[PDB]
């Protein structure tokens, strides 16, 4: 089990308010401790020195108003650090700039809002932290711009593309984390990893609009399908762990190559379980076994 | 040369303060000693003579 982002209203409380005994806030906890009612040891208040004994009585029986503002205003500014509304080095300015703002306006209806906004801003950290795990929000809106600009449902050659419409939508829903459909240049493009080692254009996909339905030769790479760019080829291998059945595997490469993209993944996860064993058995071989990779090469070439 | 005498013994003692603690034990244990904040010397008013 794991925690959510360390509670932003509590992190700032951790650094300000008393830890052990706040005699006013934890009143019936000190009162329980002084009445010899605590289950740990009853006479923990009796065996204590007489002077600090009296300090517990004066503070608990007469509750003293402790300063609450600096654990409320800091609760906003540290949430401003976790929601990233300010930079971490900005904690010197905004903490006091708003304290100087409430120095001028201590006593309007604004601070009655402020503590209600404290509960709102602390929840906004918890809302966004669960929302950044699903980076769908900066992805689906971007795909809405892709679906509108690109002409949808126009394969007047042959139609297998209706299945492909949902295939791109499945990539948004299944993996959301680093999967951002960034619109930097006017061509749309999707990143798969946190460092973006396969971020091809979804407008390199515009090469497929004339190749949505053509004739198939035989079983070896086609006499025509050499036109398919390694840019668009990178996309079609990336949608392959998402959609398989739907596109016709016998009419054009939209389906025949998509089934063949599963052959690339099908070998990969087998060889993953192959490599994790031969590398693990290095005590009995005592060599840099590149034959683990050479057999992997042999299991792809000699078929 | 045997002569007769009665000695005078005396102590020298400089550069330290004459320190005495404030407890019924009369031994400084900590900063605040027993009689420092006891039952008799705590909140009431008293005036030191010499």
Short mmCIF file of C-alpha atoms in Angstrom, two decimals:
data_model
loop_
_atom_site.label_atom_id
_atom_site.label_comp_id
_atom_site.label_asym_id
_atom_site.label_seq_id
_atom_site.Cartn_x
_atom_site.Cartn_y
_atom_site.Cartn_z
CA UNK A 1 0.00 0.00 0.00
CA UNK A 2 1.07 3.56 -0.89
CA UNK A 3 0.03 7.17 -0.16
CA UNK A 4 -1.32 10.05 -2.24
CA UNK A 5 0.87 13.21 -2.56
CA UNK A 6 1.80 14.13 1.04
CA UNK A 7 -1.25 16.16 2.12
CA UNK A 8 -0.42 19.82 1.24
CA UNK A 9 -2.47 21.39 4.06
CA UNK A 10 -0.81 18.94 6.50
CA UNK A 11 2.81 19.31 5.22
CA UNK A 12 2.65 23.04 6.05
CA UNK A 13 0.96 22.16 9.46
CA UNK A 14 3.81 19.71 10.06
CA UNK A 15 6.31 22.49 9.76
CA UNK A 16 4.38 25.00 11.92
CA UNK A 17 2.05 23.76 14.81
CA UNK A 18 3.23 21.90 17.98
CA UNK A 19 4.01 18.18 17.77
CA UNK A 20 3.80 16.50 21.19
CA UNK A 21 1.34 18.43 23.35
CA UNK A 22 -0.85 21.25 22.05
CA UNK A 23 -2.68 21.75 25.37
CA UNK A 24 -5.56 23.75 23.81
CA UNK A 25 -6.05 21.84 20.52
CA UNK A 26 -5.53 18.38 22.06
CA UNK A 27 -7.36 19.51 25.22
CA UNK A 28 -9.14 16.24 26.16
CA UNK A 29 -5.91 14.39 25.28
CA UNK A 30 -3.88 16.41 27.83
CA UNK A 31 -6.88 16.33 30.23
CA UNK A 32 -6.96 12.52 29.85
CA UNK A 33 -3.19 12.47 30.49
CA UNK A 34 -3.28 14.68 33.62
CA UNK A 35 -6.33 13.01 35.28
CA UNK A 36 -4.24 9.77 35.46
CA UNK A 37 -6.68 8.20 32.95
CA UNK A 38 -4.17 7.20 30.21
CA UNK A 39 -3.85 3.42 29.68
CA UNK A 40 -0.05 3.44 29.09
CA UNK A 41 0.86 4.41 32.67
CA UNK A 42 -1.69 6.26 34.90
CA UNK A 43 0.79 8.07 37.20
CA UNK A 44 2.97 9.53 34.42
CA UNK A 45 1.79 12.95 35.64
CA UNK A 46 2.50 12.17 39.33
CA UNK A 47 6.16 11.10 38.88
CA UNK A 48 6.96 14.15 36.71
CA UNK A 49 8.70 17.24 38.25
CA UNK A 50 6.32 19.66 40.02
CA UNK A 51 6.98 22.79 37.90
CA UNK A 52 6.22 21.37 34.41
CA UNK A 53 3.37 19.49 36.14
CA UNK A 54 1.84 22.92 36.92
CA UNK A 55 2.52 24.09 33.32
CA UNK A 56 0.23 21.31 32.05
CA UNK A 57 -2.58 22.29 34.49
CA UNK A 58 -2.51 26.07 33.76
CA UNK A 59 -2.57 25.45 29.98
CA UNK A 60 -5.24 22.70 29.83
CA UNK A 61 -7.81 23.80 32.47
CA UNK A 62 -7.65 27.34 31.03
CA UNK A 63 -7.32 26.80 27.21
CA UNK A 64 -5.00 29.40 25.63
CA UNK A 65 -5.63 30.72 22.09
CA UNK A 66 -2.75 29.51 19.89
CA UNK A 67 -1.91 31.18 16.55
CA UNK A 68 -3.73 29.46 13.62
CA UNK A 69 -3.13 31.86 10.66
CA UNK A 70 0.42 30.68 9.80
CA UNK A 71 -0.73 27.05 9.39
CA UNK A 72 -3.62 28.20 7.16
CA UNK A 73 -1.82 30.69 4.87
CA UNK A 74 1.19 28.33 4.53
CA UNK A 75 -1.29 25.50 3.79
CA UNK A 76 -2.25 27.44 0.63
CA UNK A 77 1.36 28.33 -0.38
CA UNK A 78 2.65 24.75 0.11
CA UNK A 79 -0.35 23.48 -1.90
CA UNK A 80 0.73 26.12 -4.44
CA UNK A 81 4.07 24.23 -4.42
CA UNK A 82 2.44 20.77 -4.88
CA UNK A 83 -0.17 21.90 -7.47
CA UNK A 84 2.83 23.82 -8.94
CA UNK A 85 1.10 27.23 -8.91
CA UNK A 86 4.50 28.52 -7.67
CA UNK A 87 8.12 27.31 -7.98
CA UNK A 88 9.85 25.73 -4.89
CA UNK A 89 12.23 28.73 -4.51
CA UNK A 90 9.22 31.12 -4.52
CA UNK A 91 8.28 30.00 -0.96
CA UNK A 92 9.89 33.16 0.52
CA UNK A 93 7.82 35.71 -1.41
CA UNK A 94 4.24 34.36 -1.81
CA UNK A 95 4.08 33.15 1.83
CA UNK A 96 4.56 36.73 3.09
CA UNK A 97 3.11 38.69 0.12
CA UNK A 98 -0.29 37.20 0.99
CA UNK A 99 0.46 37.65 4.72
CA UNK A 100 1.10 41.33 3.95
CA UNK A 101 -2.12 41.22 1.89
CA UNK A 102 -4.02 39.88 4.93
CA UNK A 103 -2.13 42.43 7.09
CA UNK A 104 -4.01 45.11 5.12
CA UNK A 105 -7.21 43.01 5.00
CA UNK A 106 -7.17 40.94 8.23
CA UNK A 107 -10.75 41.51 8.94
CA UNK A 108 -13.07 41.44 5.90
CA UNK A 109 -15.22 38.51 4.70
CA UNK A 110 -12.23 37.41 2.58
CA UNK A 111 -10.47 35.28 5.25
CA UNK A 112 -13.77 33.49 6.02
CA UNK A 113 -13.55 32.47 2.36
CA UNK A 114 -9.77 31.79 2.70
CA UNK A 115 -10.23 28.76 5.02
CA UNK A 116 -13.04 27.43 2.78
CA UNK A 117 -10.58 27.97 -0.10
CA UNK A 118 -7.97 26.07 2.02
CA UNK A 119 -10.25 22.99 1.82
CA UNK A 120 -10.73 23.70 -1.90
CA UNK A 121 -7.02 24.16 -2.78
CA UNK A 122 -5.94 21.07 -0.75
CA UNK A 123 -8.60 19.04 -2.62
CA UNK A 124 -7.34 20.52 -5.92
CA UNK A 125 -3.95 18.87 -5.22
CA UNK A 126 -5.70 15.51 -4.60
CA UNK A 127 -7.94 15.99 -7.67
CA UNK A 128 -5.05 16.81 -10.05
CA UNK A 129 -2.68 14.12 -8.67
CA UNK A 130 -5.29 11.47 -9.56
CA UNK A 131 -5.85 13.34 -12.85
CA UNK A 132 -2.18 13.50 -13.95
CA UNK A 133 -1.95 9.69 -13.65
CA UNK A 134 -4.67 9.72 -16.32
CA UNK A 135 -3.07 12.17 -18.80
CA UNK A 136 -6.18 11.55 -20.94
CA UNK A 137 -7.26 15.18 -20.25
CA UNK A 138 -4.40 16.62 -22.35
CA UNK A 139 -4.93 13.84 -24.91
CA UNK A 140 -8.66 13.36 -25.67
CA UNK A 141 -9.15 17.12 -26.27
CA UNK A 142 -6.12 16.93 -28.59
CA UNK A 143 -7.64 13.88 -30.35
CA UNK A 144 -10.91 15.84 -30.76
CA UNK A 145 -8.89 18.37 -32.79
CA UNK A 146 -7.37 15.47 -34.78
CA UNK A 147 -10.76 13.85 -35.54
CA UNK A 148 -12.30 17.17 -36.65
CA UNK A 149 -9.47 18.38 -38.94
CA UNK A 150 -8.68 14.98 -40.55
CA UNK A 151 -11.53 13.81 -42.88
CA UNK A 152 -13.31 10.97 -41.05
CA UNK A 153 -15.01 7.98 -42.75
CA UNK A 154 -13.91 8.55 -46.38
CA UNK A 155 -12.45 5.24 -47.64
CA UNK A 156 -14.07 5.04 -51.10
CA UNK A 157 -11.46 2.51 -52.23
CA UNK A 158 -12.11 -0.23 -49.66
CA UNK A 159 -13.29 0.32 -46.07
CA UNK A 160 -11.45 -1.23 -43.10
CA UNK A 161 -10.80 2.19 -41.50
CA UNK A 162 -14.04 2.28 -39.41
CA UNK A 163 -12.34 -0.20 -37.02
CA UNK A 164 -9.20 2.02 -37.00
CA UNK A 165 -11.19 5.06 -35.71
CA UNK A 166 -11.73 3.26 -32.37
CA UNK A 167 -8.14 1.89 -32.43
CA UNK A 168 -6.64 5.37 -31.89
CA UNK A 169 -9.29 6.07 -29.20
CA UNK A 170 -8.25 2.86 -27.37
CA UNK A 171 -4.68 4.22 -27.09
CA UNK A 172 -6.02 7.21 -25.11
CA UNK A 173 -8.08 5.06 -22.70
CA UNK A 174 -5.72 2.10 -22.00
CA UNK A 175 -2.39 3.90 -21.47
CA UNK A 176 -2.85 7.50 -20.22
CA UNK A 177 0.33 8.46 -18.25
CA UNK A 178 2.96 9.83 -20.70
CA UNK A 179 0.62 9.34 -23.69
CA UNK A 180 0.18 12.99 -24.74
CA UNK A 181 -1.15 13.82 -28.22
CA UNK A 182 1.02 16.95 -28.53
CA UNK A 183 0.13 19.62 -31.11
CA UNK A 184 3.48 21.45 -31.44
CA UNK A 185 3.76 21.57 -35.25
CA UNK A 186 0.46 21.35 -37.22
CA UNK A 187 0.96 17.60 -37.77
CA UNK A 188 -0.48 15.59 -34.86
CA UNK A 189 1.87 13.16 -33.07
CA UNK A 190 1.69 10.76 -30.12
CA UNK A 191 4.38 10.01 -27.51
CA UNK A 192 4.39 6.58 -25.82
CA UNK A 193 7.24 6.78 -23.26
CA UNK A 194 8.31 9.37 -20.62
CA UNK A 195 11.51 9.94 -22.77
CA UNK A 196 9.95 9.85 -26.32
CA UNK A 197 11.78 7.22 -28.28
CA UNK A 198 8.88 6.48 -30.78
CA UNK A 199 6.98 9.76 -31.39
CA UNK A 200 5.83 9.57 -35.02
CA UNK A 201 3.38 11.82 -36.91
CA UNK A 202 -0.33 10.98 -37.13
CA UNK A 203 -0.23 13.02 -40.36
CA UNK A 204 2.42 10.67 -41.75
CA UNK A 205 -0.68 8.47 -41.46
CA UNK A 206 -2.07 10.50 -44.43
CA UNK A 207 -0.02 8.12 -46.64
CA UNK A 208 -2.55 5.37 -45.74
CA UNK A 209 -5.60 7.23 -47.16
CA UNK A 210 -4.91 5.85 -50.67
CA UNK A 211 -3.83 2.48 -49.23
CA UNK A 212 -7.01 1.73 -47.23
CA UNK A 213 -7.87 -1.08 -49.68
CA UNK A 214 -5.56 -2.54 -52.33
CA UNK A 215 -4.84 -6.02 -53.79
CA UNK A 216 -2.73 -8.60 -51.94
CA UNK A 217 0.00 -10.68 -53.93
CA UNK A 218 1.07 -13.47 -51.90
CA UNK A 219 2.56 -13.94 -48.41
CA UNK A 220 5.89 -12.08 -48.88
CA UNK A 221 6.19 -8.24 -48.41
CA UNK A 222 4.06 -6.94 -51.32
CA UNK A 223 5.12 -5.60 -54.74
CA UNK A 224 3.23 -2.34 -53.97
CA UNK A 225 3.35 -1.95 -50.14
CA UNK A 226 7.00 -0.73 -50.12
CA UNK A 227 5.60 2.85 -50.18
CA UNK A 228 4.59 2.62 -46.48
CA UNK A 229 6.97 5.01 -44.67
CA UNK A 230 8.91 3.92 -41.50
CA UNK A 231 7.17 6.96 -39.95
CA UNK A 232 3.68 5.45 -40.51
CA UNK A 233 5.11 1.95 -39.90
CA UNK A 234 6.09 3.17 -36.40
CA UNK A 235 2.45 4.15 -35.68
CA UNK A 236 1.00 0.83 -36.91
CA UNK A 237 3.35 -1.13 -34.61
CA UNK A 238 2.31 1.17 -31.72
CA UNK A 239 -1.45 0.56 -32.22
CA UNK A 240 -0.67 -3.19 -32.46
CA UNK A 241 -0.74 -3.88 -28.69
CA UNK A 242 -4.24 -2.29 -28.68
CA UNK A 243 -6.28 -3.57 -31.67
CA UNK A 244 -5.92 -6.82 -33.67
CA UNK A 245 -9.26 -8.22 -34.90
CA UNK A 246 -11.44 -6.04 -37.14
CA UNK A 247 -9.24 -4.96 -40.06
CA UNK A 248 -9.29 -7.53 -42.90
CA UNK A 249 -6.10 -9.68 -42.62
CA UNK A 250 -6.47 -10.89 -46.23
CA UNK A 251 -7.36 -7.68 -48.23
CA UNK A 252 -4.68 -5.13 -47.59
CA UNK A 253 -1.85 -4.64 -45.28
CA UNK A 254 -4.08 -2.60 -42.85
CA UNK A 255 -4.94 -6.04 -41.48
CA UNK A 256 -2.36 -8.50 -42.87
CA UNK A 257 0.56 -6.41 -41.55
CA UNK A 258 -1.33 -5.68 -38.29
CA UNK A 259 -1.48 -9.44 -37.68
CA UNK A 260 2.23 -9.46 -38.65
CA UNK A 261 2.91 -6.65 -36.12
CA UNK A 262 1.64 -9.10 -33.46
CA UNK A 263 4.31 -11.52 -34.74
CA UNK A 264 6.94 -8.92 -33.75
CA UNK A 265 5.41 -8.59 -30.25
CA UNK A 266 4.80 -12.38 -30.08
CA UNK A 267 8.52 -13.05 -30.55
CA UNK A 268 9.52 -10.17 -28.22
CA UNK A 269 7.82 -11.35 -25.00
CA UNK A 270 8.99 -14.95 -25.59
CA UNK A 271 12.60 -13.72 -26.09
CA UNK A 272 12.14 -11.50 -22.98
CA UNK A 273 11.43 -14.67 -20.95
CA UNK A 274 14.34 -16.36 -22.80
CA UNK A 275 16.88 -13.59 -22.02
CA UNK A 276 15.88 -13.32 -18.32
CA UNK A 277 17.09 -16.93 -17.85
CA UNK A 278 20.39 -17.22 -19.80
CA UNK A 279 21.65 -13.94 -18.25
CA UNK A 280 20.51 -15.27 -14.84
CA UNK A 281 22.54 -18.47 -15.44
CA UNK A 282 25.93 -16.71 -15.55
CA UNK A 283 27.57 -18.65 -12.73
CA UNK A 284 27.69 -21.83 -14.71
CA UNK A 285 28.47 -20.31 -18.09
CA UNK A 286 31.20 -17.74 -17.12
CA UNK A 287 31.10 -15.82 -20.42
CA UNK A 288 29.53 -12.78 -22.09
CA UNK A 289 26.79 -14.82 -23.78
CA UNK A 290 25.88 -12.78 -26.86
CA UNK A 291 24.49 -16.14 -28.07
CA UNK A 292 21.42 -15.14 -26.05
CA UNK A 293 20.96 -12.38 -28.66
CA UNK A 294 22.35 -14.47 -31.55
CA UNK A 295 19.69 -17.17 -30.95
CA UNK A 296 17.13 -14.32 -30.79
CA UNK A 297 18.44 -13.25 -34.24
CA UNK A 298 18.26 -16.90 -35.42
CA UNK A 299 14.65 -17.27 -34.16
CA UNK A 300 13.61 -14.32 -36.38
CA UNK A 301 15.74 -14.81 -39.54
CA UNK A 302 15.77 -18.57 -40.31
CA UNK A 303 11.96 -19.01 -40.13
CA UNK B 1 69.90 26.54 66.20
CA UNK B 2 66.73 25.32 67.94
CA UNK B 3 64.17 28.14 68.36
CA UNK B 4 60.49 28.05 69.50
CA UNK B 5 57.48 28.98 67.31
CA UNK B 6 53.70 28.70 66.81
CA UNK B 7 52.63 28.53 63.12
CA UNK B 8 50.01 30.53 61.20
CA UNK B 9 48.11 28.53 58.55
CA UNK B 10 45.98 30.36 55.95
CA UNK B 11 44.34 29.54 52.61
CA UNK B 12 44.74 31.48 49.35
CA UNK B 13 41.75 31.30 46.96
CA UNK B 14 41.22 33.65 43.97
CA UNK B 15 39.51 33.84 40.58
CA UNK B 16 36.47 31.65 41.36
CA UNK B 17 33.08 32.68 42.81
CA UNK B 18 31.72 31.42 46.15
CA UNK B 19 28.99 29.17 44.68
CA UNK B 20 26.23 27.57 46.80
CA UNK B 21 23.12 25.76 45.39
CA UNK B 22 19.41 26.31 46.13
CA UNK B 23 17.92 22.98 47.31
CA UNK B 24 17.11 21.03 50.51
CA UNK B 25 19.87 18.64 49.39
CA UNK B 26 22.07 21.70 48.59
CA UNK B 27 23.40 20.22 45.32
CA UNK B 28 22.82 21.74 41.87
CA UNK B 29 21.01 19.10 39.78
CA UNK B 30 20.07 20.73 36.47
CA UNK B 31 19.37 24.47 36.13
CA UNK B 32 16.32 24.82 38.39
CA UNK B 33 17.20 23.20 41.73
CA UNK B 34 14.69 21.64 44.19
CA UNK B 35 14.05 24.68 46.45
CA UNK B 36 14.28 27.03 43.42
CA UNK B 37 10.69 26.14 42.53
CA UNK B 38 9.49 24.00 45.45
CA UNK B 39 6.43 24.27 47.75
CA UNK B 40 7.79 27.14 49.90
CA UNK B 41 9.72 29.15 47.26
CA UNK B 42 7.50 29.20 44.14
CA UNK B 43 4.97 32.07 43.82
CA UNK B 44 4.97 33.78 47.25
CA UNK B 45 6.99 36.93 48.08
CA UNK B 46 10.04 36.82 50.40
CA UNK B 47 12.90 39.29 51.09
CA UNK B 48 16.55 38.22 51.53
CA UNK B 49 18.50 39.77 54.43
CA UNK B 50 22.14 39.10 55.45
#
